[PDB]
Amino acid sequence: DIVMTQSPDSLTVSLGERATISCKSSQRLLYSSNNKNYLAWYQQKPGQPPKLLMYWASTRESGVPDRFSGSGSGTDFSLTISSLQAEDVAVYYCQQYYNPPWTFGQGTKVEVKRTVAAPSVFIFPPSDEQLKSGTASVVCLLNNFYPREAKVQWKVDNALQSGNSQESVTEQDSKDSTYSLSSTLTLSKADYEKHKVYACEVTHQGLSSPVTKSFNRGE
Amino acid sequence: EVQLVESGGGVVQPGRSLRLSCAASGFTFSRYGMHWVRQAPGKGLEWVAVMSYDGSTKYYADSVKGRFAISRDNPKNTLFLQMNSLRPDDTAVYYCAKGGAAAAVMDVWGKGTTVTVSSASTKGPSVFPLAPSGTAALGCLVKDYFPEPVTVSWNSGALTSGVHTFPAVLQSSGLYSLSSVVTVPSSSLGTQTYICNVNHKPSNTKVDKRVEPK
């Protein structure tokens, strides 16, 4: 079984700069009899299925832009994106097809490095609909910031909440290169009704001091 | 153009079986070898199996050899995967893939079907508004479903710009929750309708919710 190893695991590139992804095969992928390397590259943008970019090491698939170049021979291969564009954020996979089992490299994530941007923060109360089931979700949205690192602190009538929230973060946006994050606080219906002021406090590099969005239950 | 649509995913209890299908269109299915490839969530691609054009030749990953059987039906343009003795680590998106003319590569992929092996059964979601009130935000909260995935589109797909749909979070209850939001200018809040279309195919749940200020 032929082992494919990629390097590095992750690249963070400035717009217009060069990304270089390396792929190393545990077995020579060159066939003496036809002088072709049985190596392919795939691109998988966030939330989408993989697309074939390259085969025979360097032959571009139809529709692949000419900022992508595949090269190498033998055991050592390379995928280069000259002059990276925002669209190109993805995970890239090399793959040998010299022989079964077809095997993939572990994947290399590519992201854009960009200017610092502060999140826009939005707070949502639970709907009246939800309450009828015994529980309440308060949602706090951190929109289009950079870099990825960010802090959400929930407060309920000035009490700092912990252990009762969960967060998730989108993959970097393909046009403005930002991230977004949703945080959900969970409360019993009875608890949500006993308190008034619900607040989402946000810390991030692009803000000089924490931002707090709030609502009073009952509006 | 070439299309591969996978089907048959959902949740299965440990130990049991599941059959996936792949409806191929837009090419002569009879002339091409076809693959199954899978991807655990947040993880890499893993080749599963392949069957040749006329069906006389197969190969399987060691991971699945003897457990899985690839087959195909040429007159009906359909590729199958019969999966047996499933375990939680078989949990993944399963992509159907067409072989290249060309070279033994996968030149076209389906979007995949999501397979989940766990000790929990199908449960449809409830949908709750994330209500608004320069730039305003609204959304829907798609709550307490299993297994993955749900999809959310806005205004039947007409509204894409400024849409963010977040990775589902697994709650302490073992049920998923997913949030989808869109940002629009605040003066546009009552100026047109914003409707989130939610689908949870394992439960046959289909919801259109209009979101509005109070």
Binding site: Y31, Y38, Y98, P100 | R31, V50, G99, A103
Partner: peptide, 11 residues
């Protein structure tokens, strides 16, 4: 060892 011939996979 020779690579497998794509012709045995797709015609």
């Amino acid at each position: 060892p020779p690579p497998i011939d794509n012709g045995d996979i797709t015609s």
